[PDB]
Design a protein around this ligand. Sequence first.
Ligand code: GTP
Ligand code: GDP
Lengths: 430, 430
Amino acid sequence: MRECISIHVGQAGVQIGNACWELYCLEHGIQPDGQMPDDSFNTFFSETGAGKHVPRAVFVDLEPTVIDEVRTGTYRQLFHPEQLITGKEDAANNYARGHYTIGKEIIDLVLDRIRKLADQCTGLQGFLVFHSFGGGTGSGFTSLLMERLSVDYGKKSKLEFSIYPAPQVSTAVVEPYNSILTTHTTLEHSDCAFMVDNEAIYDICRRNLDIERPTYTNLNRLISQIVSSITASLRFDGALNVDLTEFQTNLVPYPRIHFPLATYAPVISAEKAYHEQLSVAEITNACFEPANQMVKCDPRHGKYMACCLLYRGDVVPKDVNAAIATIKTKRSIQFVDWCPTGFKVGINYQPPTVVPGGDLAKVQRAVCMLSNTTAIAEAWARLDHKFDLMYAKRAFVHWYVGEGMEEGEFSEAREDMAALEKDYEEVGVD
Amino acid sequence: MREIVHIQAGQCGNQIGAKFWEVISDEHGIDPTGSYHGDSDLQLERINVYYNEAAGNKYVPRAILVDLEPGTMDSVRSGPFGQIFRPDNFVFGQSGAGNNWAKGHYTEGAELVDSVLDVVRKESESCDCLQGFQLTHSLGGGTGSGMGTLLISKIREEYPDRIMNTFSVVPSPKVSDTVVEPYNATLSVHQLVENTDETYCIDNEALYDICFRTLKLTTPTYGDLNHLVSATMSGVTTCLRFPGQLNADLRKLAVNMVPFPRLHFFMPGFAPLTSRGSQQYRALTVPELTQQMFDAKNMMAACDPRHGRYLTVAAVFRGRMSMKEVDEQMLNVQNKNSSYFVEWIPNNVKTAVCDIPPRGLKMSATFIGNSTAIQELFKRISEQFTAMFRRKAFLHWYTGEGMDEMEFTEAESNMNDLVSEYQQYQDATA
Ligand SMILES: Nc1nc2c(ncn2[C@@H]2O[C@H](COP(=O)(O)OP(=O)(O)OP(=O)(O)O)[C@@H](O)[C@H]2O)c(=O)[nH]1
Ligand SMILES: Nc1nc2c(ncn2[C@@H]2O[C@H](COP(=O)(O)OP(=O)(O)O)[C@@H](O)[C@H]2O)c(=O)[nH]1
């Protein structure tokens, strides 16, 4: 009943998946071994006959290190070995290697395992995908898996918690190639995706979490907190719940434009927990600031289609309505004439659950805000500007060419992104 | 992409490879008998990349030693760790080539190339998921250069799917065994660029200069150069011998570094330089070394990067890191020398951080760069070959072994084509 499958591919994908599943099992009081000391956990979990609960997800990669780390980590007894897919030869920062040359030897096993997991699912609702744009595995393998799943199922929703590479955390120089190729490939195949810029989380950790130098651990803890705030609606119940079908309904102008921008509040470090906790009005007023989104964009330029809210903790609806009324008076918010209003409001009375030993501090209440806008265009603008700088001299092209690729793919992906940004300004003009 | 096999040839190459193994075993806590003797678990995590497990807990290098002169091989077991290498690796000749390429290529290279391919096969299907092959060898010496050409040709026609690295010892006019070196040097560099994809240009000119002016050695013997050779060429492998999210494998190294299929030559550098027995260095701060990377005086390729533009830059830091200031040094270096980086490759200056430091030094930073400025070495060898070849001298020995001057003409034309590629990529705008 209402099952939802999670897909984790690539190093970053599996790292953030481990973090998010840890937060999920902690929130629902699920022990690290899966034992029970809302009944919506069955959407994200499968109940073994012994009473143990194992997540209905999968760990896929072409590299054996991080999978082995999971196999010897805290939750090694949580997941069965079969959904922890292990490769031998990695894509090595190459969309082509992770798509054609090497992915083919593993995609068959991957889809067999996905079907095996789905065998226990009756009311399957959709697919959650976690993958880094920069990584060759998490781009080529992600794109081909997206194509295969769309062939297999199609109309079923297929989410994507995409990771946007950032120069501070970037590990390869071919990252714009991989991001362009994967987004051009999955744009038709993905109905809604989440586009989180790791520079945003990095500088939030630098400033808000006062981390001297953010690491993968803190980045992924923050990312998992935000993803948990997003998925609380599927993992709990609310007055106006949002589901994957509802995600598509309330956050898609056109199938091409399916990249909502998210903001989550608040961000208080554990070392400063003694300070007065922020109010609903305070968090609403601090939500739209350029230091709280998922990408390094200024929402002032953009115009919101609809503003979706998800509230966590002890939040009173009356003050929510007051805050919404105050915010609507702001000149920052602008709605297209075609879309009058889409202000869905969701309240989760469950207080947020903090990770033990985490930099962030426990708060009584929290809110995460979803709203897509034309301000998101600047991320693709800088990204495809980097791609154009790449392609003006055909740098690194031979590495793709030697693995079943030609420059025609580069050209068609670049023009597809040009059409996508074209749609961006076109919907942004009344 | 899991393991590396080693091949060394030529007395220079054999000596430098032996010293490399000395350094690697010492930093990984490997005793002469192969048993672990370190003090941390970091070394043993990735010890498999350069070693094989043996009876009990003995670790043996995956090094196949080849040489045509018995003196070199007697010497190579004469030194330390002469017994750790298994006798199977030792497949050798007796005639001696003596500064000639084609004669050792055909008249005497056939009867041992079969054996070396047999042993590298035994290693290969003994190995599970090897990344590729890295070779250290001399270029001016006809023996080592010819053996290296044989090995590269056979391994590429046998294992074209493996990223096959190599390390090059460019001949030096100042320290030259003979004068007919540029013939074999040009032939071997032609074969190298036309057949390999990863090479480090370690010219003895730069080594002699740095050991003379900076080490205050009036007559630096081959051991004096070999000390710095071993230090830096362990430094390049630091990213391949310890955990790290940068430069995990040889394939990732290629994808990150080399932008063009033909141009794949490297210009290795490392600071701080350390003499033999000189341990007066204090705790060197990051700013001085990160401004010292721009220097060509600490460069192990006889070229000056100030005359060219960096394509892609790699560097690894070892010691205690407050690497926030390291990132600050990146920012300052970029903002101050963007003119020396190609604008059409953004975010090409990436570095990692390592915690294991070299021996006797608590701070170190290798500097691996790929720039068009390396064309100075090829211009030097081109002018040498032309000024000593327009007389059509010394060709009797080669022409007596089937060599035809058309091969010389095509090789020199191809290498001038590489020089032209350097020139055209250097002046490319944004
Ligand atoms: N969100 C997130 N991104 C990360 C993390 N670690 C690395 N990345 C980014 O992910 C990109 C690289 O992708 P990978 O994590 O290596 O995943 P992959 O597709 O398997 O790539 P390969 O390991 O080379 O096969 C780089 O831009 C990294 O900066 C992380 O802990 N979280
Ligand atoms: N750094 C270094 N260079 C060497 C060494 N031996 C020879 N060379 C240089 O390499 C060239 C000679 O190559 P050689 O070692 O004779 O190759 P071989 O014929 O295969 O033995 C000369 O330019 C020498 O100056 C050495 O032990 N160390």
